[PDB]
Amino acid sequence: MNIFEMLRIDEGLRLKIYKDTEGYYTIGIGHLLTKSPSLNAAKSELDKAIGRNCNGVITKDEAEKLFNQDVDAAVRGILRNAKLKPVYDSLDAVRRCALINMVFQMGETGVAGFTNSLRMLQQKRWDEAASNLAKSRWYNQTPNRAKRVITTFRTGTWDAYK
């Protein structure tokens, strides 16, 4: 199990524009296109992202190319963030995947907002951080995925994914 396989399980793969859990226009492997209600605002973004006229549809390769960019961007974002970096640095290899997962899903700014949980992870208080992470909109909106990530933070193993 690695970060790629983990996110691919959590996000799925779709070759045609679809709407995410929040109702936003998405494509491929969790690649957010626009928060705009316009399908046209989405087809536009998509062609801009791919560099071709897609007409809302992409190939597997194109979807994986986006996925690669987004994971890389997620990682560099954590490393550049004053709030996130220390946390990441303090963690083992499995738990690091769990933080990258949240960041990919909710953006750097969102996760950086989990002040208390971040502090508990840094202190290696696994159980307490798992409890606090659960008191969030995130967990209430996408409970199965949140539980998986949370379990990963609690245990340090890939159990939740196998």
Which among 20, 47, 64, 128 is annotated as catalytic?
20
Is 132 flagged in the annotation as binding?
yes
Is 90 flagged in the annotation as binding?
no
Is 104 flagged in the annotation as binding?
yes
Q: Which amino acid is at 115?
A: T
- Least separation in angstroms between residue 137's CB and Cl ion is 7
Residues 6+ apart with CB under 8 A from 80: none
Give the Cα separation of 133 and 151 in Å (integer).
Answer: 11
**Based on CB atoms, which residue is closest to Cl ion, 59 or 115?**
115
Give the Cα separation of 49 and 54 in Å (integer).
Answer: 10
Q: Is residue 11 among the annotated active site residues?
A: yes
- Least separation in angstroms between residue 140's CB and Cl ion is 6
Residues that bind Cl ion (CB under 5 A): 135, 142, 144-145
Give the H or E element holding residue 44: helix 39-50
Binding residues for substrate: 32, 104, 117, 132
Any idea which residues carry the catalytic annotation?
11, 20
